[PDB]
Structure formats: structure tokens, C-alpha cells
Amino acid sequence: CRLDKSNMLAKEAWNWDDITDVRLIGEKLFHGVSMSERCYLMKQVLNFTLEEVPFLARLSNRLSTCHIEGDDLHIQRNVQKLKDTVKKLGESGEIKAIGELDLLFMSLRNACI
């Protein structure tokens, strides 16, 4: 799968959230997952997230056709780690998930181009 280069707070975000804290979106989300398959993992996080906005759906819609071949469990197990965490925190899961909506973008772009 792939997107293109083509596709307001800015990164002044760290004035408001301690950059030294744990994030939902981080290195561990990608453990065991090959380069060629990162955009597909990053689609799953996009589609969990929205589904549980305008800019986001423009990127999502395009990735309907994005899949891999063979078993994707090594991917879904990583995504499920995020979902479990974005629920176990309840309110805070939602808000923390909502709070990193931009990291989801930086990661999406970077994997899909």
C-alpha cells in the first residue's frame, strides 16, 4: 500500500504535553513488522481509531484497497495492544487517543510514502 507526499497547532504540542511521557503511538507498535507492511499496520490504527476527521477519511478511503498477503496476525496483535490500552484507560484512553491524533498523521505519512 501507499499514499503520496501531496497528502495548525503544529508541533508546539510539547508545550502542553510532556514529551518525556509514554505515548500510545510509539516504537513498540511496530515491533516485528516489516517496512513493506508498516502502511498496512498504520491503516489498521487509522480504522480502529476513526471507527472507535475530514483529513483522516480522505487518507482512509484510499486505503480500503490496501492489504497484504498471507496471515496478518503479527500486525493485528500489535494493533490490539493499542485498542486494549485506548480502552483500559476509559475516558483517558479516548482522550489520550484523541490527544495524539497528530502522531497518527506523522506516522501514517512517513510509512505510506
Epitope: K11, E12, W14, N15, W16, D17, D18, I19, T20, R23, I25, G26, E27, F30, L103, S107
Partner: antibody, heavy 125, light 106 residues
Amino acid sequence: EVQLLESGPGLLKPSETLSLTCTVSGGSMINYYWSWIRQPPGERPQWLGHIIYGGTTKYNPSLESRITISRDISKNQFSLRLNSVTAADTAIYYCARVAIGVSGFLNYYYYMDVWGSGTAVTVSS
Amino acid sequence: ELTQSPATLSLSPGERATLSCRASQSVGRNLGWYQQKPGQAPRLLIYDASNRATGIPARFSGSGSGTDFTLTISSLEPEDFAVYYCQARLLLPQTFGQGTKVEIKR
């Protein structure tokens, strides 16, 4: 050039409250973190805590129950309070500006890039 | 955590000095080195493994990545005999390494 000037008392008695202020000149407090560091005699520098522009703090857990860090953006100051001092708190205390940002694989950098000249704090009866 | 070697380095002026820092887990390239002379505040020397901080002269250089890092002073001047500390991210309880003291050999 950005300059940080610590201000605090040189001498305290046990059980007093230490309080120190740093005045930031020649730069702004937005887009940096602001830290307190101390260096006990004979030791390496030790990080006490930081504060971000928004007011969230993080503290060294070993001082956690005694330490407060605050900031006053309209004055370009930030402050340290440490309760119930003993001889164990004797050290040179430094304020430091922290440069932070994203780097590596979804990670960060953190450098104490501008330091005050330090204020010696002795606790003694 | 960060391990500096050696505790003390005894060298002659004009000599080249090489200091090591090893991290127990990767810090990528986000390591810094600081200099402190006696009486004075520490000072940032090198950041992101190899970039000279403001005002730092050309004889100071650094390299490494992951876990293994090196600070080089290509020709020691009188003013360079001091303690050097490494630091990477916000590591607790010890944010700084133990330090390497660069002493004049005679």
C-alpha cells in the same frame, strides 16, 4: 544570549523550606522545558524536576513528597520549593533550560542547553 | 543507564583525548556531552552525538549511535582539563553518567 540567574538563600536551617527562583533573560519560556538540577559535594549533577510551558511538571521520585516546581510566564521566572530540608540537601543548585523535541523512531531529545551559574545551599543548625 | 570510562584520564596538553560512554539500551543518536570545570556550572558541549553546541570549538567532536558513544578532543588545551559527563533523554534516577575527569599527566 539567553541567561539564567538563580536566586535563593545560601543558608538554611534543618526543617526550613528551600526556595529558589530563576529569572530567564534574553529569551522566552515557550518551546523549552525548565529544569532544576543539584550537585551534592563530590557527586555528579542530579535532576530534580522540570516544568513545561503549560504548567505540567515531572519530579525526581526520590524528592517527590517534598518538591514543588512552578513558573510565572509573565515574569519570565520559574521556581523550586523543597520542604523539610536536612544536611542531605546541601548542594549547588542550578536552573537549566531544556531543549526538547521529536527525534529517532517516534522518540525524543532532551538537552540542558543553558545553565545558571549555580547557587550553593547549605543546611546547617 | 549510562556508563563512562575511564573514571580518570591522565594526559598531556596537546595530546588527543578519547572518552567513552556506553548506554545499556539504545538511545539512538540523542546523546549529549557536558563539560564542567571546578567551581563552575556544567556546560553543553555536544548534542545528538556529534553536533557542537553554541560556542564550542572545533577540537571537540563526537560520534556513535545506539549504545556506544565517543567524545574526542583532538588536541588538549589547558582549559580542557575538567570533568566530562554524558546524558541522553530523561533517564532516572541518574540522568548523567558518572563523569570522566581529564587530569594533567606528569
